[PDB]
Amino acid sequence: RNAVPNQVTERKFLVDRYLWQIPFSSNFLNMGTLTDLGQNVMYANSSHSLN
């Protein structure tokens, strides 16, 4: 009955024992071990960089 007004709420989460995986495929699911975007780096000596 005596609760204070203006109660701002705020959230968080905890993820333990887990690596944030980012798959390298067209849709982000698993159709194969050798992915579909991973196969299209062969053509004309196919050198890529990234940051």
Add this chain to the structure above:
Amino acid sequence: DPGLKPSSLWTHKIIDSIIANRSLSAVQNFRKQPLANKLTALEDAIVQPRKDTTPETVAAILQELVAMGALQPNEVGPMFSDLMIRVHKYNSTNVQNNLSVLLGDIRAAQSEAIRSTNVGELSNQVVLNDFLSREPAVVPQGQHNYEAFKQTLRLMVNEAPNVTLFKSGPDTLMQVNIRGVNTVNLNSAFKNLKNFWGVQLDTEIVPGSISSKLSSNTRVLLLFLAPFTNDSTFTPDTFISQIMRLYRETVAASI
């Protein structure tokens, strides 16, 4: 072979089966492949990988000495690695000719056993007894039509005038002189006839959906075996025993 030979060499052979000898089935498999499986067959057109045939030639004559009963089968374990360690050391042209002349006497010894005994007359049975080997030999819902179907199939191999009965890589075909659709795949006809042995013609809301699952492959096999059977054959009032007296009387009447 012992065997030292791999099977299904399609990554080396699919590209000269399209260019040379123009196979339509090799094109349909090649378009289906992913891009990584496709690029590992385009280099083998350009450069072909050279394989050393020395350990396959040395192991060919160790199996002959087992076949002649010269040495026990537990001895080609240690004696093979004792003969390969000698030809790795003393490798020369005089040694590589000694392997080929000994290998040329293996094939010439067994080709004399083919022409003298005339087992080429029984070349149909050898391909056919190899086909009835890896089969389960015990089917569910069947087993009297299934045993009798093999005996009438072995009867057709011996009694029909000209049946070639060759085989491709995975399966076994069968070619008779009726022009057009000569060939019958015996392997995919036994997967269609896997369930249709002990089927009895009782549960049909509509006639059909039992005789319609018979594909055009296995229906021609039931047409070729129809004259060479009897009524003292497949157990009565079943589905396969009434096909074989329907297809028999559409051949014995169409003369």
